């Protein structure tokens, strides 16, 4: 068959884990900082428990089990893995705790400490992430700095799959009927024709690198998504960030070509940032770059990514 997804889907017990703090809430629901302690096993694993809402019909069309489906499949150092699922009325998605938050938040808080080695490496890690998804014929459809999580300052993972759509053997594009949308991140091709390819993902990767090099700005700030379509059409793009050479800028700008076959492929993006991250400062002029590189109760018997290899 066209790749029998012989993945596994683990079922867990709301008893063998304890919530500890709300990390956030949107319309979707709530994610809690949590502790998972599989019975028997002498391990305690830090987790995020993502609880959502029901409805009069939307609760029973795969409220998230779609997401649990895509995340149940992916295995890659730079993509969030779903540890398991919880079959309470509001099914819980159990996930590895990314203990440093979203990157968008992170770069803001630490601007005057982020180095160029760091920025370029998150650039390399996210392309590696996205390239895995392209391997698995997956289209993230919502790549942004907010949706990249921080495990360590030297290890990030792509993180939100509410909108992820797997392509079928004869599908070069997807066509999302509608809903709300993150306009200032989407390829022009998308913003007009609901068409999403891996290459519209590259457009998003572009805004993401931009978010990263502005230490967390908002793209087209001020401007309302209402007319992003219009300014983009006449030819405007996001500015060159002050820390960026032509080299880094010419890259983001390529991700924003109007012909999407004319944008870079993730496989190439990692080759390029890879090269930059060896001589980081030919490429990122960061003032003083040079002098630049939980609430744990009782732990002891703990683990994390290293249990997921059960
Ligand atoms: C250290 O604990 C966290 C804290 C923080 N915040 C909030 C508290 N303070 C402000 C610090 C910043 C974040 N966050 O979002 O910035 C993440 C983690 N860790 C984590 N691990 C796995 C996951 Cl799945 C997940 N999802 C998560 C958590 C909250 C909000 C939205 C999401 P999402 C859209 C990707 O589903 N979060």
- Residue 209 makes CB contacts below 8 A (sequence gap 6+) with 123, 248, 251, 252, 255
Q: Which long-range contacts (CB under 8 A, 24 or more apart) does 263-267 make?
A: 263/199, 263/202, 263/203, 263/206, 264/202, 265/134, 265/198, 265/199, 265/202, 266/127, 266/128, 266/130, 266/131, 266/134, 266/198, 266/201, 266/202, 266/205, 267/131, 267/134
* Structure-solving method: X-ray
Separation of alpha carbons 173 and 204, rounded Å: 16
Same-domain pairing of 158 and 270: yes
Same-domain pairing of 81 and 181: no
The last residue of one of the domains, among 56, 71, 96, is 96
Residue 295 falls inside a structural domain: no
Query: Would you state the torsion angle of the CA atoms of residues 214, 220, 221, 226, taken in this order, to the nearest 10 degrees?
Result: -160
Which residue in this structure is represented by tokens 């599908």? 171
Residue 294 falls inside a structural domain: no
Same-domain pairing of 84 and 107: no
Q: Is 94 in the pocket of ligand 1 (CB under 6 A)?
A: no
Residue nearest to atom 11 of ligand 1 (CA): 101
Separation of alpha carbons 207 and 184, rounded Å: 8
CATH at 81: 3.30.200.20
> What is the three-class DSSP state of 9?
coil
Query: How many whole angstroms from 51 Cα to the centroid of ligand 1?
Result: 13
Structural domain total, the chain: 2
Same-domain pairing of 149 and 164: yes
Residue 4 falls inside a structural domain: no
Residue among 22, 23, 308 to mutate when testing ligand 1 (max atoms within 8 A of CB): 23
Same-domain pairing of 163 and 204: yes
The last residue of one of the domains, among 96, 131, 154, is 96
Q: What is the 3-state secondary structure (H, E, C) of 219-246?
A: CCCCCCHHHHHHHHHHCCCCCCCCCECH
Residue 251 falls inside a structural domain: yes
Residue 192 falls inside a structural domain: yes
Residue 210 falls inside a structural domain: yes
Same-domain pairing of 170 and 261: yes
Same-domain pairing of 129 and 248: yes
The last residue of one of the domains, among 51, 80, 96, is 96
Distances (CA, A) of 97 to 33, 66, 93, 265, 286: 7, 21, 12, 30, 31
Same-domain pairing of 61 and 204: no
- Give the atom of ligand 1 at the shortest distance from the alpha carbon of 99: 1
Q: Which of 212, 216, 183, 213 is nearest to 200 (CA)?
A: 183
Query: How many whole angstroms from 105 Cα to the centroid of ligand 1?
Result: 10
Residue nearest to atom 1 of ligand 1 (CA): 99
Same-domain pairing of 123 and 81: no
Separation of alpha carbons 106 and 103, rounded Å: 5
Same-domain pairing of 68 and 113: no
CA 286 to chain centre: 25
Same-domain pairing of 159 and 174: yes
Structural resolution in Å? 2.8
Residue 291 falls inside a structural domain: no
Range of the domain at 39: 11-96
Residue 200 falls inside a structural domain: yes
> What is the three-class DSSP state of 113?
helix
Q: Is 92 in the pocket of ligand 1 (CB under 6 A)?
A: no
In whole angstroms, how large is the CA radius of gyration of the chain?
Answer: 20
CATH at 129: 1.10.510.10
């Amino acid at each position: 068959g066209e790749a029998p997804n012989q993945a596994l889907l683990r079922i867990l017990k709301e008893t063998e884990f304890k919530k500890i703090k709300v990390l956030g809430s949107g319309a979707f629901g709530t994610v809690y900082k949590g502790l998972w302690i599989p019975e028997g096993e002498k391990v305690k694993i830090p987790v995020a428990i993502k609880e959502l809402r029901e409805a009069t019909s939307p609760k029973a069309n795969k409220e998230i089990l779609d997401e649990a489906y895509v995340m149940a499949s992916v295995d890659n150092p730079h993509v969030c893995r779903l540890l398991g699922i919880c079959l309470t009325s509001t099914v819980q998605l159990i996930m590895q705790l990314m203990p440093f938050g979203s990157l968008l938040d992170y770069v803001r808080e630490h601007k005057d400490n982020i180095g160029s080695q760091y920025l370029l490496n998150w650039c390399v890690q996210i392309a590696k992430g996205m390239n895995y998804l392209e391997d698995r014929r997956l289209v993230h459809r919502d790549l942004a700095a907010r949706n990249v999580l921080v495990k360590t300052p030297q290890h990030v993972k792509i993180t939100d799959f509410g909108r992820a759509k797997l392509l079928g053997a004869e599908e070069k594009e997807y066509h999302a009927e509608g809903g709300k949308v993150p306009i200032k991140w989407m390829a022009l091709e998308s913003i007009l024709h609901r068409i999403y390819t891996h290459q519209s993902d590259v457009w998003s990767y572009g805004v993401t690198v931009w978010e990263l090099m502005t230490f967390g700005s908002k793209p087209y700030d001020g401007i309302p998504a209402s007319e992003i379509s219009s300014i983009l059409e006449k030819g405007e793009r996001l500015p060159q960030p002050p820390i960026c050479t032509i080299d880094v800028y010419m890259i983001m700008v390529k991700c924003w070509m109007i012909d999407a076959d004319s944008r870079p492929k993730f496989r190439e993006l990692i080759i390029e940032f890879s090269k930059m991250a060896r001589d980081p400062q030919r490429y990122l002029v960061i003032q003083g770059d040079e002098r630049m590189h939980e609430e744990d109760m009782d732990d002891v018997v703990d683990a994390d990514e290293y249990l997921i290899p059960q």
